[PDB]
Amino acid sequence: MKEFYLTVEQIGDSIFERYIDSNGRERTREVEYKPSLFAHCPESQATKYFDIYGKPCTRKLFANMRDASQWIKRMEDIGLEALGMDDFKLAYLSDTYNYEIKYDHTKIRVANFDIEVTSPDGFPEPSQAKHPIDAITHYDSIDDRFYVFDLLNSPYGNVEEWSIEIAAKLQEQGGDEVPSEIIDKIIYMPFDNEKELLMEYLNFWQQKTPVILTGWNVESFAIPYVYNRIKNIFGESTAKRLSPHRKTRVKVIENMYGSREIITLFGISVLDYIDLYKKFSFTNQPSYSLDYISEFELNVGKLKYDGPISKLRESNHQRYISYNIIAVYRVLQIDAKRQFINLSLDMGYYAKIQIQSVFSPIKTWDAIIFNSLKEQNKVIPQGRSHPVQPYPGAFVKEPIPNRYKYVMSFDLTSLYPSIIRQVNISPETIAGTFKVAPLHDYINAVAERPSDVYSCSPNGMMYYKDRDGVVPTEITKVFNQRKEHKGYMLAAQRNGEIIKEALHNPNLSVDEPLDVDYRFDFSDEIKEKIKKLSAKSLNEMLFRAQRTEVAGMTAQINRKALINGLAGALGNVWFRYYDLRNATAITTFGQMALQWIERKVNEYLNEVCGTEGEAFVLYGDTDSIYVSADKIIDKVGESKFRDTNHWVDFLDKFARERMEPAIDRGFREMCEYMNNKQHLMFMDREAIAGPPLGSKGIGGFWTGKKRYALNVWDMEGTRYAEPKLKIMGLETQKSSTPKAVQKALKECIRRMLQEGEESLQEYFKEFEKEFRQLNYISIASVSSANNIAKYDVGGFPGPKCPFHIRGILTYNRAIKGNIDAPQVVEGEKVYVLPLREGNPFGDKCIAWPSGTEITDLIKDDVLHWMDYTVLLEKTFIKPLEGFTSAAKLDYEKKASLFDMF
DNA sequence: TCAAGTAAGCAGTCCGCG
DNA sequence: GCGGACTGCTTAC
Ligand SMILES: O=c1ccn([C@H]2C[C@H](O)[C@@H](COP(=O)(O)NP(=O)(O)OP(=O)(O)O)O2)c(=O)[nH]1
Ligand SMILES: [Mn+2]
Ligand SMILES: [Mn+2]
Ligand SMILES: [Mn+2]
Ligand SMILES: [Mn+2]
Numbered sequence: 001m002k003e004f005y006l007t008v009e010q011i012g013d014s015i016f017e018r019y020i021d022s023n024g025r026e027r028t029r030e031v032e033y034k035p036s037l038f039a040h041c042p043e044s045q046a047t048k049y050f051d052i053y054g055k056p057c058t059r060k061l062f063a064n065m066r067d068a069s070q071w072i073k074r075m076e077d078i079g080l081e082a083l084g085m086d087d088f089k090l091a092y093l094s095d096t097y098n099y100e101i102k103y104d105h106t107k108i109r110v111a112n113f114d115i116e117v118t119s120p121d122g123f124p125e126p127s128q129a130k131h132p133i134d135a136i137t138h139y140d141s142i143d144d145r146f147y148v149f150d151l152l153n154s155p156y157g158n159v160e161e162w163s164i165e166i167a168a169k170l171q172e173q174g175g176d177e178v179p180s181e182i183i184d185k186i187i188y189m190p191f192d193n194e195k196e197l198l199m200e201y202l203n204f205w206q207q208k209t210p211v212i213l214t215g216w217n218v219e220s221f222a223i224p225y226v227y228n229r230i231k232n233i234f235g236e237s238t239a240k241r242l243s244p245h246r247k248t249r250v251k252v253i254e255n256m257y258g259s260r261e262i263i264t265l266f267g268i269s270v271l272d273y274i275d276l277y278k279k280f281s282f283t284n285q286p287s288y289s290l291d292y293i294s295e296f297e298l299n300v301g302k303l304k305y306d307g308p309i310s311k312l313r314e315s316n317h318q319r320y321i322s323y324n325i326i327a328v329y330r331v332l333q334i335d336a337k338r339q340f341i342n343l344s345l346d347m348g349y350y351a352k353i354q355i356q357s358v359f360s361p362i363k364t365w366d367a368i369i370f371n372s373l374k375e376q377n378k379v380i381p382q383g384r385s386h387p388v389q390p391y392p393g394a395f396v397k398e399p400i401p402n403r404y405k406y407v408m409s410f411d412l413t414s415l416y417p418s419i420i421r422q423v424n425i426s427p428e429t430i431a432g433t434f435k436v437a438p439l440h441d442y443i444n445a446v447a448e449r450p451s452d453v454y455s456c457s458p459n460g461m462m463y464y465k466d467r468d469g470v471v472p473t474e475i476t477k478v479f480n481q482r483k484e485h486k487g488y489m490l491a492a493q494r495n496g497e498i499i500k501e502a503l504h505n506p507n508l509s510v511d512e513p514l515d516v517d518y519r520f521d522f523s524d525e526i527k528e529k530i531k532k533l534s535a536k537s538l539n540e541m542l543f544r545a546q547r548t549e550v551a552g553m554t555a556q557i558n559r560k561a562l563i564n565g566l567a568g569a570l571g572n573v574w575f576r577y578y579d580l581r582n583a584t585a586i587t588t589f590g591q592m593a594l595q596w597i598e599r600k601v602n603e604y605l606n607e608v609c610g611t612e613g614e615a616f617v618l619y620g621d622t623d624s625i626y627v628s629a630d631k632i633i634d635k636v637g638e639s640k641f642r643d644t645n646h647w648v649d650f651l652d653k654f655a656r657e658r659m660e661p662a663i664d665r666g667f668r669e670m671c672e673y674m675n676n677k678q679h680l681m682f683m684d685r686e687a688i689a690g691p692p693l694g695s696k697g698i699g700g701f702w703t704g705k706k707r708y709a710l711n712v713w714d715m716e717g718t719r720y721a722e723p724k725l726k727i728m729g730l731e732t733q734k735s736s737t738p739k740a741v742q743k744a745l746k747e748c749i750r751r752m753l754q755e756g757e758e759s760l761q762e763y764f765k766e767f768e769k770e771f772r773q774l775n776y777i778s779i780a781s782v783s784s785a786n787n788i789a790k791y792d793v794g795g796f797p798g799p800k801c802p803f804h805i806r807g808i809l810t811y812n813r814a815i816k817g818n819i820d821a822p823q824v825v826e827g828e829k830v831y832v833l834p835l836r837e838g839n840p841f842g843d844k845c846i847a848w849p850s851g852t853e854i855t856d857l858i859k860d861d862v863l864h865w866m867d868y869t870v871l872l873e874k875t876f877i878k879p880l881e882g883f884t885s886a887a888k889l890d891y892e893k894k895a896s897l898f899d900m901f
Numbered sequence: 902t903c904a905a906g907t908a909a910g911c912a913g914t915c916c917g918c919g
Numbered sequence: 920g921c922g923g924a925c926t927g928c929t930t931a932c
């Protein structure tokens with residue numbers, strides 16, 4: 001096969017590379033790499049090398065990397081540009097792998113581990129590692145085995161060996177329920193002493209040295225803890241055996257209060273799964289314990305036990321070891337669903353970067369663009385310094401707050417990059433400028449046409465129409481990948497609705513799920529075979545379809561994030577191709593397109609409805625329009641459809657047949673106007689929304705910008721079995737809203753939209769009567785905790801102290817002295833509850849870390865003092881008043897000028 | 902040169918107010 | 920007790 005790399009590092013004048021050779025074997029090599037950089041020279045020069053502007057360049061071949069750096073610095077001291085790729089590991093990979101890399105993931109050792117450390121005296125600080133490591137479980141993807149290192153004797157208790165037969169039993173039969181499909185994959189190794197355990201771990205690590213290293217929080221706890229514990233017992237140089245080149249960086253910062261640590265292990269690409277999840281998952285969780293996310297992602301149950309984890313090894317070593325194995329497996333399960341490692345690998349190899357660089361869009365694109373330029377024998381510009389300048393972004397229309405019964409929506413496909421391709425925006429396609437009118441004049445087609453010769457944006461920029469840009473070119477490739485995957489995703493989603501519907505009519509037999517690809521729309525024969533399957537079969541198919549759709553989501557939305565990352569990068573001073581002219585060319589064009597198309601859609605709709613000067617477009621954000629369909633529905637009545645699906649079918653046809661072509665005509669005109677290279681403003685229909693036919697529902701409402709709810713029947717061609725609420729911005733969407741209040745406001749909204757005022761009130765009365773019976777954690781607010789120290793001391797609230805930060809201080813005073821209480825962590829999220837006046841805490845609110853019950857120390861007298869009246873009003877009534885005042889309903893009634901028996 | 906962007910809502914603090 | 924200027928956080932895009 002063709003070779004590919006695993007890791008690369010720069011060590012002085014040395015590149016260290018781990019790689020897979022042409023035979024499939026893992027190898028390592030040290031290369032004294034000779035880098036090249038370039039300098040402009042006179043046009044009188046025989047040279048194949050030009051920079052991206054067409055200026056001639058001469059190559060300088062250096063004997064080592066140190067020299068290249070030295071030269072770069074003299075060039076600055078002289079004031080002349082030093083061109084070329086200055087991140088030498090990137091250039092090396094580009095020289096070494098001059099082809100599209102087809103990697104083979106079964107040869108990439110992916111490791112996943114979790115450690116346990118008993119700690120009677122508070123959270124075990126990694127920067128100190130003063131406690132024994134009493135368990136490690138380490139899964140190796142190539143062995144497909146879980147290696148378990150278990151400490152039987154430690155100064156914190158002697159325990160006997162762990163039992164694999166008891167691990168397997170149902171929890172109800174006294175077992176730990178280690179899932180059956182991994183029981184056979186476990187390899188168990190007890191140890192009399194910590195030293196022999198760590199020694200043996202290090203020996204294992206050498207034989208099976210991770211390429212990709214993951215886990216939950218491994219970056220902040222496991223890795224630094226292991227590194228520092230090995231250091232303390234054996235010395236640093238032994239601790240350095242964790243790096244395949246024996247080099248590490250610490251790192252630092254710290255800082256207070258009181259200390260944290262991050263180790264860098266050269267020759268390993270660490271991808272902490274919690275980071276992969278934050279970047280790639282597009283959720284905002286109230287908490288990031290493995291148990292919360294596992295439950296969220298997998299629908300598995302909380303990992304139950306009695307007593308604090310500081311006594312768990314002692315009271316029940318058996319469960320302790322089993323829960324350690326399970327945590328590792330759980331991260332394996334989250335990844336089989338989300339597929340973030342596979343994505344990281346796709347992106348990393350595509351860009352030709354270090355796999356951990358996928359966290360960096362700027363770095364990812366620097367390498368993609370660099371590689372694309374080096375193929376044409378071109379020379380990248382030097383990275384310059386720039387001051388940080390704010391600049392204008394998208395347009396958002398101000399909506400009239402109201403209920404809106406029937407609404408269709410339309411949204412532009414991949415807007416920013418589409419713009420980049422339509423206008424042909426690139427550092428090296430800049431043609432000149434033109435004198436700019438106010439933006440309203442373009443939108444209204446009254447300003448003079450910018451140019452006859454160049455592609456333009458209403459920010460005043462002009463671009464060459466003939467030559468293609470490195471940016472448009474490379475941004476198209478990734479776009480095309482996103483398109484593909486989105487299709488798989490949507491198809492799996494439609495396939496999902498078809499299965500759901502068939503679940504209304506099983507159908508009693510004994511069968512197997514059909515063998516099919518959920519990435520493509522079910523054929524008619526397949527649809528036939530399905531209408532005759534059992535509930536078992538069909539449920540297995542729904543699961544499979546929903547997993548194919550999740551995979552499609554991951555692959556498509558993150559490819560979109562990448563491309564959008566490029567547009568935003570142009571506005572980041574650390575980006576080699578930073579340039580506000582390009583950044584604003586994109587954004588300003590986007591504001592124009594949205595407002596232009598608003599005008600056009602109003603013009604077309606007034607026409608066909610024969611009416612005049614009426615607003616059909618009710619809202620719009622960046623690249624979307626929301627269209628009232630009341631008068632399109634009314635033009636016909638009402639009657640006059642048989643059921644909901646009928647009018648949905650109507651509007652669908654009307655969008656596809658009448659509106660779609662006028663929109664396209666509208667944007668075709670806009671393209672001509674700006675004389676663009678290619679027409680790519682494609683605005684597909686999104687939601688079709690309204691109340692169930694016959695009901696008293698309102699269908700939808702806006703309260704303001706970025707705050708609306710819609711009852712949707714069809715979404716971008718997916719006709720839903722049951723109506724699905726599209727809620728944007730409302731408290732139901734905010735991670736800081738208590739879980740139970742989220743659910744309650746959602747149900748209030750479901751009612752308003754589907755059933756009307758009377759149903760709303762009915763439910764609101766019930767929730768008020770029952771509020772106080774809820775679990776305290778389900779009605780607690782949530783907040784991130786930044787810049788905490790600032791608002792001490794000592795330790796009481798200082799001036800301007802935020803409410804949640806106040807709660808942490810109240811917590812910090814409550815737990816002063818008890819070495820057992822779990823500590824709030826700077827930058828982490830916290831639960832927050834208000835307290836009644838006269839509480840023994842001495843203030844109006846308390847806060848503890850999230851995803852955790854509050855410590856039994858103070859728990860009992862927090863419950864006693866929680867202020868329900870304030871909670872309900874703050875988190876539930878205020879926001880509800882918002883919704884209903886906007887949609888002109890009341891949640892209570894209402895003094896009716898009656899009343900009477 | 903370790904480093905995608907802007908727009909904009911709401912909850913809270915501090916101050917004003919016979 | 921309510922509205923205006925500010926911080927802090929959080930979504931929508
Ligand atoms: O995180 C984002 C999201 C969107 N945007 C910009 C770019 C995007 O093209 C534009 C429109 O927002 P959408 O949510 O519609 N995404 P896009 O149009 O790219 O993709 P699509 O509509 O095809 O899903 O807003 C960002 O700059 N950053
Ligand atoms: Mn024994
Ligand atoms: Mn059970
Ligand atoms: Mn654990
Ligand atoms: Mn969309």
Ligand SMILES: [Mn+2]
Pocket residue numbers: 411412413414415623
């Ligand atoms: Mn869009």
Ligand SMILES: [Mn+2]
Pocket residue numbers: 411412413684716
């Ligand atoms: Mn779309």
Ligand SMILES: [Mn+2]
Pocket residue numbers: 411412621622623624932
């Ligand atoms: Mn959009």
